[PDB]
């Protein structure tokens, strides 16, 4: 502040939602809108990237991990929620010892 008064760079206070329009809570202002909009834009950006990879899959794509990894009925990916260092089904003598 070189030639500015402190009574000039005061604090303008921000306004609230109208009490008649109060069930839609919190009238949002420009900081809230930019927090909304850049979130939407980064999620659309990663959706567009994934759509382009789906367009450029190249179906002659062999990996060695598509022996172990498998696919459910709708076509999505089965991820086994147990381990991947364990086994989901345990043997009969293991069940004998645990029981």
């Amino acid at each position: 502040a070189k030639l500015v008064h402190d009574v000039q760079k005061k604090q303008h206070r921000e306004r609230s939602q109208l009490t008649s329009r109060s069930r839609y809570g919190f009238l949002e202002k420009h900081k809230d809108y930019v927090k909304r909009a850049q979130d939407f834009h980064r999620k659309q950006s990663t959706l567009k990237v994934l759509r382009e990879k789906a367009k450029e899959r190249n179906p002659d794509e062999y990996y060695h991990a598509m022996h172990s990894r498998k696919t459910d009925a709708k076509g999505l990916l089965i991820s086994s929620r147990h381990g991947d260092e364990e086994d989901e089904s345990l043997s009969m003598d293991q069940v004998k010892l645990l029981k």
């Binding site: 994934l50 990879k53 789906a54 899959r57 190249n58 991990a65 990894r69 999505l76 990916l77 086994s80």
Partner: protein, 99 residues
């Protein structure tokens, strides 16, 4: 969260597959078997959880405060470097204008 559509994610490459594991609806035997201890052990578990979240939130507060510190140090440092480079590019023209 980012909700990628099923029509896109069934047609994704093998590297770009999204490992989304389904919730468990069956009361499996290992979960109905496995024992948890009580009393002093459950208050030890509660204590260790409280200590670990206080440590993690303190670390997050510290690193956010360091981010706010070093962005303004970056600002003043770039201003001082711009003033320095202005002084260098006028002193060089002085030197060559004299010689």
């Amino acid at each position: 969260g980012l909700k990628v559509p099923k029509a896109v994610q069934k047609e994704l490459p093998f590297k770009s597959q999204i490992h989304q594991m389904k919730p468990q609806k069956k009361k499996t035997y290992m979960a109905k078997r496995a024992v948890v201890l009580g009393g002093d052990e459950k208050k030890a578990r509660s204590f260790i959880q409280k200590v670990l979240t206080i440590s993690k939130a303190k670390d997050s507060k510290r690193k956010e405060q360091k981010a706010s510190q070093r962005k303004e140090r970056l600002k003043k440092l770039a201003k001082m470097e711009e003033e320095k480079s202005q002084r260098d590019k006028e002193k060089k023209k002085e030197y060559f204008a004299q010689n």
